[PDB]
Amino acid sequence: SILEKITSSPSECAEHITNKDSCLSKKIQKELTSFLQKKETLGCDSESCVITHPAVKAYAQQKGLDLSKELETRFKAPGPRNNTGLLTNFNIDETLQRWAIKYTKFFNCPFSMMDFERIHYKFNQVDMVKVYKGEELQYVEGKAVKRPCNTFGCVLNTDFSTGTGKHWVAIFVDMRGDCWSIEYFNSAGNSPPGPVIRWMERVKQQLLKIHHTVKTLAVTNIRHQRSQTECGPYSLFYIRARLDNVSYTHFISTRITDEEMYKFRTHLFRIA
């Protein structure tokens, strides 16, 4: 249901790719037409599996084709697409970097300030006002970028606060509407840790310098997740749904199942 709301699809091509049918460049389509049409005999059922096959890698090295750039620029990030394996910081960082291509007013948090309570004591911190004004460095594709952003997104691990282990939660700052909101989404329904509260409060004072209505909000009313594996997909789906203008009130009043989030893995990662 709600998976139909957002603008993603199970295709493994990059979201900004208009072709949609084939993810490969038209040159790479030509040079590898022999391998692509016998992909089943290579043990493959996708273009990403073909250009990662060792025989295709050798043929590409012969002809001077950069297959690694094809995977980074025209395909979605690699990750547990068809299994329930836990998301890593690399799966999340490389996914948010790709969404920043399509959503050009979206600020994806860097890799260092991703999953750490130490963000209050890190040497260089993010300034949400400088984010809004376009004066903060973000990394879109593999390139540094400064641009005005009215949305901010980050996924962090709450394992620093005592718990069973890795648990991803999402943080989203919506500066598009007349009332800006700093949002904390926990699929399990647990309140934010103290350090998260201080960070949300600090961002509110900053944003109150350039806007009149700023709310801090803990989206922890419903325990959506009953599995032990989908907190990663839950956190990424919240950011994507908010980017596609699904209100946070939907995550407050209506439950989102682990089945829907397991299917969301096919929207996140390529077949690799």
Q: Which residues contact 207 (CB under 8 A, 6 or more apart)?
A: 128, 129, 132, 173, 175, 180, 182, 214
Percent composition of the chain: helix, strand, coil (DSSP 3-state, to 5): 40, 15, 45
Of 75-83, 136-144, 170-178, 261-269, the window that binds a second copy (rule: CB under 8 A) is: 170-178
Nearer to a second copy, 6 or 42 (CB): 6
- Three-state DSSP class for 250? helix
Footprint of a second copy on 197-256 (CB under 8 A): 211-213, 215, 245, 247-249
Q: Of 65, 96, 175, 231, which one interacts with a second copy (CB under 8 A)? A: 175
Nearer to a second copy, 86 or 217 (CB): 217
Q: Of 179, 201, 221, 226, which one interacts with a second copy (CB under 8 A)? A: 179
What minimum distance in Å lies between the beta carbon of 181 and a second copy?
5
Q: What is the CA 22 to chain-centroid distance, rounded? A: 22
Q: Is 13 a catalytic residue?
A: no
How many CB atoms sit inside 10 A of residue 233's CB?
29
Nearer to a second copy, 137 or 210 (CB): 210
Nearer to a second copy, 116 or 248 (CB): 248
Q: Is 167 a catalytic residue?
A: yes
- Residue linked to tokens 């994507």: 240
Q: Of 25, 73, 88, 150, which one interacts with a second copy (CB under 8 A)? A: 150
Tokens of 109: 């948090």
The catalytic position among 44, 91, 167, 267 is 167
Q: Which residues pair with 218 in a beta bridge?
A: 184
Cα distances (Å, whole numbers) of residue 6 to 87, 164, 183, 200, 253: 21, 31, 19, 26, 18
What minimum distance in Å lies between the beta carbon of 233 and a second copy?
24
Which residues does the annotation place in the binding site for substrate?
A: 225
Active site residues: 167, 186, 231
